[PDB]
Amino acid sequence: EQAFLQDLDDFQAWLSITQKAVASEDMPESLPEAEQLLQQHAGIKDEIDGHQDSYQRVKESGEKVIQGQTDPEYLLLGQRLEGLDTGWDALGRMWESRSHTLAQCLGFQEFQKDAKQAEAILSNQEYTLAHLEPPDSLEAAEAGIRKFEDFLGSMENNRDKVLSPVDSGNKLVAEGNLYSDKIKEKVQLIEDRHRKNNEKAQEASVLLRDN
């Protein structure tokens, strides 16, 4: 009564250790962290699939071992095997659930990074659109117009960087991501500033041309 027990002891311990790791409530707070946890979770899956076969052998053998036995040792071993089946199923579900949550966390972190980039682009656009300098001379007049044209060119260049988080955000919300509240709010503010900047830039274009 050694090889079987050792393996049971071993698997149960591995199970206990893996359930704990998966039971973690640690939520990513950065995109690199989010990628880290995903990697670790992926590794845990490999360990789980790697233990499946041995789990089955222990399960099936456990039944034969206790079968027909009446000594306390076997009755206790029998209860222990019930635990194993439970913990094994519990682990599977815990993993799936944990995997599900980290994916959402990766999605939100990515969005957060892109959303912050768009906010910066937008703040800068707002700064430029905030004040127009009256030409002190012909040289200044040419410079103003030209500088603004390049500005308009950059608005067009960053267009994708601004709209990107809007599309990724809405999609996250559409998938029912757990951060939806924060995401909805940030997506709206971006959309609104993007809309206002464009309108304000169109008016400015006219101003610089007719004055």
PDB file of C-alpha atoms in Angstrom:
ATOM      1  CA  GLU A   1       0.000   0.000   0.000  1.00  0.00           C
ATOM      2  CA  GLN A   2       2.759   2.430  -1.033  1.00  0.00           C
ATOM      3  CA  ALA A   3       2.902   3.335  -4.742  1.00  0.00           C
ATOM      4  CA  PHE A   4      -0.832   4.061  -4.936  1.00  0.00           C
ATOM      5  CA  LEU A   5      -0.915   6.096  -1.721  1.00  0.00           C
ATOM      6  CA  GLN A   6       2.233   8.047  -2.565  1.00  0.00           C
ATOM      7  CA  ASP A   7       0.673   9.013  -5.889  1.00  0.00           C
ATOM      8  CA  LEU A   8      -2.603   9.936  -4.182  1.00  0.00           C
ATOM      9  CA  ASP A   9      -0.713  12.045  -1.620  1.00  0.00           C
ATOM     10  CA  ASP A  10       1.277  13.632  -4.425  1.00  0.00           C
ATOM     11  CA  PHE A  11      -1.670  14.411  -6.654  1.00  0.00           C
ATOM     12  CA  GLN A  12      -3.714  15.804  -3.801  1.00  0.00           C
ATOM     13  CA  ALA A  13      -0.855  18.104  -2.822  1.00  0.00           C
ATOM     14  CA  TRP A  14      -0.327  19.225  -6.393  1.00  0.00           C
ATOM     15  CA  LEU A  15      -4.076  19.779  -6.564  1.00  0.00           C
ATOM     16  CA  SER A  16      -4.117  21.833  -3.354  1.00  0.00           C
ATOM     17  CA  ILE A  17      -1.188  23.948  -4.555  1.00  0.00           C
ATOM     18  CA  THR A  18      -2.666  24.514  -8.005  1.00  0.00           C
ATOM     19  CA  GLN A  19      -6.159  25.378  -6.703  1.00  0.00           C
ATOM     20  CA  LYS A  20      -4.582  28.013  -4.490  1.00  0.00           C
ATOM     21  CA  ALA A  21      -2.558  29.580  -7.285  1.00  0.00           C
ATOM     22  CA  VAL A  22      -5.698  29.679  -9.436  1.00  0.00           C
ATOM     23  CA  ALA A  23      -7.745  30.968  -6.489  1.00  0.00           C
ATOM     24  CA  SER A  24      -5.707  34.195  -6.583  1.00  0.00           C
ATOM     25  CA  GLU A  25      -7.641  37.475  -6.500  1.00  0.00           C
ATOM     26  CA  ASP A  26      -4.676  39.465  -7.819  1.00  0.00           C
ATOM     27  CA  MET A  27      -5.989  41.751 -10.546  1.00  0.00           C
ATOM     28  CA  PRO A  28      -3.585  43.281 -13.088  1.00  0.00           C
ATOM     29  CA  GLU A  29      -2.943  46.987 -12.703  1.00  0.00           C
ATOM     30  CA  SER A  30      -0.895  47.420 -15.858  1.00  0.00           C
ATOM     31  CA  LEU A  31      -0.809  45.952 -19.354  1.00  0.00           C
ATOM     32  CA  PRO A  32       2.529  44.231 -18.778  1.00  0.00           C
ATOM     33  CA  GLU A  33       1.188  42.776 -15.548  1.00  0.00           C
ATOM     34  CA  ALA A  34      -1.930  41.632 -17.398  1.00  0.00           C
ATOM     35  CA  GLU A  35       0.248  39.815 -19.918  1.00  0.00           C
ATOM     36  CA  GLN A  36       2.259  38.274 -17.085  1.00  0.00           C
ATOM     37  CA  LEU A  37      -0.725  36.720 -15.300  1.00  0.00           C
ATOM     38  CA  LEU A  38      -2.095  35.365 -18.562  1.00  0.00           C
ATOM     39  CA  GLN A  39       1.200  33.626 -19.229  1.00  0.00           C
ATOM     40  CA  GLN A  40       1.234  32.149 -15.724  1.00  0.00           C
ATOM     41  CA  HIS A  41      -2.377  31.011 -16.109  1.00  0.00           C
ATOM     42  CA  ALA A  42      -1.527  29.398 -19.453  1.00  0.00           C
ATOM     43  CA  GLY A  43       1.258  27.501 -17.733  1.00  0.00           C
ATOM     44  CA  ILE A  44      -1.168  26.276 -15.092  1.00  0.00           C
ATOM     45  CA  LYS A  45      -3.446  24.907 -17.801  1.00  0.00           C
ATOM     46  CA  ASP A  46      -0.586  22.867 -19.205  1.00  0.00           C
ATOM     47  CA  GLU A  47      -0.048  21.463 -15.724  1.00  0.00           C
ATOM     48  CA  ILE A  48      -3.728  20.618 -15.407  1.00  0.00           C
ATOM     49  CA  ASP A  49      -3.920  18.827 -18.747  1.00  0.00           C
ATOM     50  CA  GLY A  50      -0.680  17.100 -17.822  1.00  0.00           C
ATOM     51  CA  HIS A  51      -2.238  15.679 -14.675  1.00  0.00           C
ATOM     52  CA  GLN A  52      -5.490  14.543 -16.281  1.00  0.00           C
ATOM     53  CA  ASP A  53      -4.246  11.081 -17.211  1.00  0.00           C
ATOM     54  CA  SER A  54      -2.704  10.359 -13.822  1.00  0.00           C
ATOM     55  CA  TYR A  55      -5.877  11.715 -12.192  1.00  0.00           C
ATOM     56  CA  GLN A  56      -7.949   9.113 -14.001  1.00  0.00           C
ATOM     57  CA  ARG A  57      -5.584   6.261 -13.114  1.00  0.00           C
ATOM     58  CA  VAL A  58      -5.715   7.248  -9.470  1.00  0.00           C
ATOM     59  CA  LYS A  59      -9.481   7.588  -9.588  1.00  0.00           C
ATOM     60  CA  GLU A  60     -10.118   4.208 -11.205  1.00  0.00           C
ATOM     61  CA  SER A  61      -7.530   2.410  -9.080  1.00  0.00           C
ATOM     62  CA  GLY A  62      -8.907   4.000  -5.942  1.00  0.00           C
ATOM     63  CA  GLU A  63     -12.238   2.309  -6.582  1.00  0.00           C
ATOM     64  CA  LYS A  64     -10.653  -1.120  -6.973  1.00  0.00           C
ATOM     65  CA  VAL A  65      -8.471  -0.662  -3.908  1.00  0.00           C
ATOM     66  CA  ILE A  66     -11.342   0.101  -1.512  1.00  0.00           C
ATOM     67  CA  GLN A  67     -13.843  -2.170  -3.215  1.00  0.00           C
ATOM     68  CA  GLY A  68     -15.238  -4.678  -0.758  1.00  0.00           C
ATOM     69  CA  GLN A  69     -12.945  -3.444   1.992  1.00  0.00           C
ATOM     70  CA  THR A  70     -14.452  -2.759   5.427  1.00  0.00           C
ATOM     71  CA  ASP A  71     -11.500  -1.593   7.516  1.00  0.00           C
ATOM     72  CA  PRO A  72     -11.545   2.082   8.677  1.00  0.00           C
ATOM     73  CA  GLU A  73      -8.451   2.744   6.603  1.00  0.00           C
ATOM     74  CA  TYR A  74     -10.306   1.931   3.368  1.00  0.00           C
ATOM     75  CA  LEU A  75     -13.499   3.734   4.380  1.00  0.00           C
ATOM     76  CA  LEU A  76     -11.360   6.813   5.069  1.00  0.00           C
ATOM     77  CA  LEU A  77      -9.462   6.317   1.820  1.00  0.00           C
ATOM     78  CA  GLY A  78     -12.829   6.133   0.104  1.00  0.00           C
ATOM     79  CA  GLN A  79     -13.882   9.516   1.495  1.00  0.00           C
ATOM     80  CA  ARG A  80     -10.512  10.913   0.498  1.00  0.00           C
ATOM     81  CA  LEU A  81     -11.125   9.810  -3.113  1.00  0.00           C
ATOM     82  CA  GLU A  82     -14.430  11.639  -3.123  1.00  0.00           C
ATOM     83  CA  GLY A  83     -12.562  14.761  -2.112  1.00  0.00           C
ATOM     84  CA  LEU A  84     -10.108  14.238  -4.949  1.00  0.00           C
ATOM     85  CA  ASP A  85     -12.882  14.017  -7.558  1.00  0.00           C
ATOM     86  CA  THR A  86     -14.418  17.188  -6.142  1.00  0.00           C
ATOM     87  CA  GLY A  87     -11.211  19.186  -5.939  1.00  0.00           C
ATOM     88  CA  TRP A  88     -10.322  18.042  -9.431  1.00  0.00           C
ATOM     89  CA  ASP A  89     -13.617  19.303 -10.869  1.00  0.00           C
ATOM     90  CA  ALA A  90     -13.499  22.440  -8.729  1.00  0.00           C
ATOM     91  CA  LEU A  91     -10.024  23.237 -10.078  1.00  0.00           C
ATOM     92  CA  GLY A  92     -11.210  22.923 -13.650  1.00  0.00           C
ATOM     93  CA  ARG A  93     -14.034  25.357 -13.124  1.00  0.00           C
ATOM     94  CA  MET A  94     -11.857  27.756 -11.108  1.00  0.00           C
ATOM     95  CA  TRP A  95      -9.335  27.842 -13.918  1.00  0.00           C
ATOM     96  CA  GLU A  96     -11.926  28.559 -16.613  1.00  0.00           C
ATOM     97  CA  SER A  97     -13.404  31.305 -14.492  1.00  0.00           C
ATOM     98  CA  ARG A  98      -9.990  32.770 -13.684  1.00  0.00           C
ATOM     99  CA  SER A  99      -8.958  32.570 -17.334  1.00  0.00           C
ATOM    100  CA  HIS A 100     -12.149  34.383 -18.270  1.00  0.00           C
ATOM    101  CA  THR A 101     -11.410  37.243 -15.873  1.00  0.00           C
ATOM    102  CA  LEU A 102      -7.785  37.823 -16.854  1.00  0.00           C
ATOM    103  CA  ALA A 103      -8.758  37.978 -20.521  1.00  0.00           C
ATOM    104  CA  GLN A 104     -11.111  40.816 -19.627  1.00  0.00           C
ATOM    105  CA  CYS A 105      -8.316  42.404 -17.648  1.00  0.00           C
ATOM    106  CA  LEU A 106      -5.949  42.229 -20.586  1.00  0.00           C
ATOM    107  CA  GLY A 107      -8.640  43.795 -22.767  1.00  0.00           C
ATOM    108  CA  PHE A 108      -9.248  46.634 -20.342  1.00  0.00           C
ATOM    109  CA  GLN A 109      -5.536  47.330 -19.836  1.00  0.00           C
ATOM    110  CA  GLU A 110      -4.938  47.501 -23.596  1.00  0.00           C
ATOM    111  CA  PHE A 111      -7.902  49.844 -23.932  1.00  0.00           C
ATOM    112  CA  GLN A 112      -6.704  51.974 -21.033  1.00  0.00           C
ATOM    113  CA  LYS A 113      -3.332  52.476 -22.687  1.00  0.00           C
ATOM    114  CA  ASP A 114      -4.886  53.364 -26.046  1.00  0.00           C
ATOM    115  CA  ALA A 115      -7.487  55.559 -24.387  1.00  0.00           C
ATOM    116  CA  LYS A 116      -4.765  57.537 -22.602  1.00  0.00           C
ATOM    117  CA  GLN A 117      -2.917  58.053 -25.855  1.00  0.00           C
ATOM    118  CA  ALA A 118      -6.043  59.416 -27.526  1.00  0.00           C
ATOM    119  CA  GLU A 119      -6.657  61.707 -24.562  1.00  0.00           C
ATOM    120  CA  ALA A 120      -3.184  63.211 -24.961  1.00  0.00           C
ATOM    121  CA  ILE A 121      -3.630  63.719 -28.706  1.00  0.00           C
ATOM    122  CA  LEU A 122      -6.984  65.349 -27.980  1.00  0.00           C
ATOM    123  CA  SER A 123      -5.606  67.637 -25.258  1.00  0.00           C
ATOM    124  CA  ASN A 124      -2.929  68.836 -27.602  1.00  0.00           C
ATOM    125  CA  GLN A 125      -5.451  69.420 -30.391  1.00  0.00           C
ATOM    126  CA  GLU A 126      -7.580  71.315 -27.892  1.00  0.00           C
ATOM    127  CA  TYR A 127      -4.554  73.464 -26.997  1.00  0.00           C
ATOM    128  CA  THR A 128      -3.904  74.396 -30.606  1.00  0.00           C
ATOM    129  CA  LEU A 129      -7.570  75.053 -31.362  1.00  0.00           C
ATOM    130  CA  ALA A 130      -7.784  77.148 -28.193  1.00  0.00           C
ATOM    131  CA  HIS A 131      -6.128  80.297 -29.545  1.00  0.00           C
ATOM    132  CA  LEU A 132      -5.368  81.760 -32.961  1.00  0.00           C
ATOM    133  CA  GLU A 133      -2.596  84.284 -33.509  1.00  0.00           C
ATOM    134  CA  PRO A 134      -3.366  87.373 -35.652  1.00  0.00           C
ATOM    135  CA  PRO A 135      -0.724  87.945 -38.372  1.00  0.00           C
ATOM    136  CA  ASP A 136       1.829  90.608 -37.402  1.00  0.00           C
ATOM    137  CA  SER A 137       3.069  90.600 -40.992  1.00  0.00           C
ATOM    138  CA  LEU A 138       3.014  88.677 -44.276  1.00  0.00           C
ATOM    139  CA  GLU A 139       5.662  86.299 -42.955  1.00  0.00           C
ATOM    140  CA  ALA A 140       3.582  85.573 -39.862  1.00  0.00           C
ATOM    141  CA  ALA A 141       0.402  85.224 -41.895  1.00  0.00           C
ATOM    142  CA  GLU A 142       2.071  82.617 -44.107  1.00  0.00           C
ATOM    143  CA  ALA A 143       3.534  80.863 -41.073  1.00  0.00           C
ATOM    144  CA  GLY A 144       0.247  80.764 -39.175  1.00  0.00           C
ATOM    145  CA  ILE A 145      -1.706  79.284 -42.057  1.00  0.00           C
ATOM    146  CA  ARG A 146       1.035  76.799 -42.884  1.00  0.00           C
ATOM    147  CA  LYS A 147       1.538  75.714 -39.281  1.00  0.00           C
ATOM    148  CA  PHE A 148      -2.209  75.173 -38.954  1.00  0.00           C
ATOM    149  CA  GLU A 149      -2.326  73.202 -42.184  1.00  0.00           C
ATOM    150  CA  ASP A 150       0.332  70.865 -40.797  1.00  0.00           C
ATOM    151  CA  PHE A 151      -1.731  70.776 -37.636  1.00  0.00           C
ATOM    152  CA  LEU A 152      -4.737  69.690 -39.680  1.00  0.00           C
ATOM    153  CA  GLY A 153      -2.520  67.129 -41.330  1.00  0.00           C
ATOM    154  CA  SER A 154      -1.607  65.696 -37.940  1.00  0.00           C
ATOM    155  CA  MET A 155      -5.240  65.570 -36.816  1.00  0.00           C
ATOM    156  CA  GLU A 156      -5.829  63.361 -39.812  1.00  0.00           C
ATOM    157  CA  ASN A 157      -2.745  61.319 -38.994  1.00  0.00           C
ATOM    158  CA  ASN A 158      -3.810  60.685 -35.391  1.00  0.00           C
ATOM    159  CA  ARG A 159      -7.395  60.019 -36.416  1.00  0.00           C
ATOM    160  CA  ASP A 160      -6.856  56.264 -36.028  1.00  0.00           C
ATOM    161  CA  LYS A 161      -5.101  56.626 -32.678  1.00  0.00           C
ATOM    162  CA  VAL A 162      -8.086  58.605 -31.433  1.00  0.00           C
ATOM    163  CA  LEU A 163     -10.831  56.373 -32.806  1.00  0.00           C
ATOM    164  CA  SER A 164      -9.004  53.176 -31.899  1.00  0.00           C
ATOM    165  CA  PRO A 165      -9.958  53.139 -28.218  1.00  0.00           C
ATOM    166  CA  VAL A 166     -13.526  54.090 -29.184  1.00  0.00           C
ATOM    167  CA  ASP A 167     -13.864  50.936 -31.256  1.00  0.00           C
ATOM    168  CA  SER A 168     -11.995  48.686 -28.828  1.00  0.00           C
ATOM    169  CA  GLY A 169     -13.930  50.148 -25.935  1.00  0.00           C
ATOM    170  CA  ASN A 170     -17.395  49.651 -27.401  1.00  0.00           C
ATOM    171  CA  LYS A 171     -16.377  46.136 -28.332  1.00  0.00           C
ATOM    172  CA  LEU A 172     -15.270  45.370 -24.774  1.00  0.00           C
ATOM    173  CA  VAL A 173     -18.570  46.751 -23.536  1.00  0.00           C
ATOM    174  CA  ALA A 174     -20.322  44.629 -26.150  1.00  0.00           C
ATOM    175  CA  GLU A 175     -18.588  41.540 -24.791  1.00  0.00           C
ATOM    176  CA  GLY A 176     -19.813  42.501 -21.340  1.00  0.00           C
ATOM    177  CA  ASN A 177     -16.332  43.260 -19.981  1.00  0.00           C
ATOM    178  CA  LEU A 178     -16.263  43.810 -16.195  1.00  0.00           C
ATOM    179  CA  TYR A 179     -14.873  47.361 -16.490  1.00  0.00           C
ATOM    180  CA  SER A 180     -17.701  48.563 -18.745  1.00  0.00           C
ATOM    181  CA  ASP A 181     -18.520  51.468 -16.419  1.00  0.00           C
ATOM    182  CA  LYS A 182     -15.065  52.995 -16.716  1.00  0.00           C
ATOM    183  CA  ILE A 183     -14.871  52.065 -20.368  1.00  0.00           C
ATOM    184  CA  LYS A 184     -18.222  53.580 -21.345  1.00  0.00           C
ATOM    185  CA  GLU A 185     -17.349  56.849 -19.653  1.00  0.00           C
ATOM    186  CA  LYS A 186     -13.920  57.127 -21.271  1.00  0.00           C
ATOM    187  CA  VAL A 187     -15.201  56.149 -24.709  1.00  0.00           C
ATOM    188  CA  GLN A 188     -17.869  58.839 -24.566  1.00  0.00           C
ATOM    189  CA  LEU A 189     -15.496  61.615 -23.474  1.00  0.00           C
ATOM    190  CA  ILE A 190     -13.163  60.699 -26.311  1.00  0.00           C
ATOM    191  CA  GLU A 191     -15.933  60.633 -28.904  1.00  0.00           C
ATOM    192  CA  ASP A 192     -17.148  64.005 -27.682  1.00  0.00           C
ATOM    193  CA  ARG A 193     -13.759  65.710 -27.694  1.00  0.00           C
ATOM    194  CA  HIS A 194     -13.015  64.209 -31.114  1.00  0.00           C
ATOM    195  CA  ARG A 195     -16.284  65.647 -32.418  1.00  0.00           C
ATOM    196  CA  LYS A 196     -15.695  69.081 -30.899  1.00  0.00           C
ATOM    197  CA  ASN A 197     -12.075  69.325 -32.029  1.00  0.00           C
ATOM    198  CA  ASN A 198     -13.049  68.550 -35.622  1.00  0.00           C
ATOM    199  CA  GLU A 199     -15.841  71.124 -35.660  1.00  0.00           C
ATOM    200  CA  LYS A 200     -13.660  73.712 -33.982  1.00  0.00           C
ATOM    201  CA  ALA A 201     -10.829  72.941 -36.423  1.00  0.00           C
ATOM    202  CA  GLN A 202     -13.174  73.475 -39.381  1.00  0.00           C
ATOM    203  CA  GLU A 203     -14.211  76.877 -38.094  1.00  0.00           C
ATOM    204  CA  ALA A 204     -10.585  77.794 -37.415  1.00  0.00           C
ATOM    205  CA  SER A 205      -9.667  76.828 -40.939  1.00  0.00           C
ATOM    206  CA  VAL A 206     -12.146  79.393 -42.229  1.00  0.00           C
ATOM    207  CA  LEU A 207     -11.007  82.055 -39.770  1.00  0.00           C
ATOM    208  CA  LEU A 208      -7.374  81.778 -40.863  1.00  0.00           C
ATOM    209  CA  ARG A 209      -8.450  82.025 -44.479  1.00  0.00           C
ATOM    210  CA  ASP A 210     -10.816  84.990 -44.178  1.00  0.00           C
ATOM    211  CA  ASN A 211      -8.745  87.099 -41.803  1.00  0.00           C
TER     212      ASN A 211
END
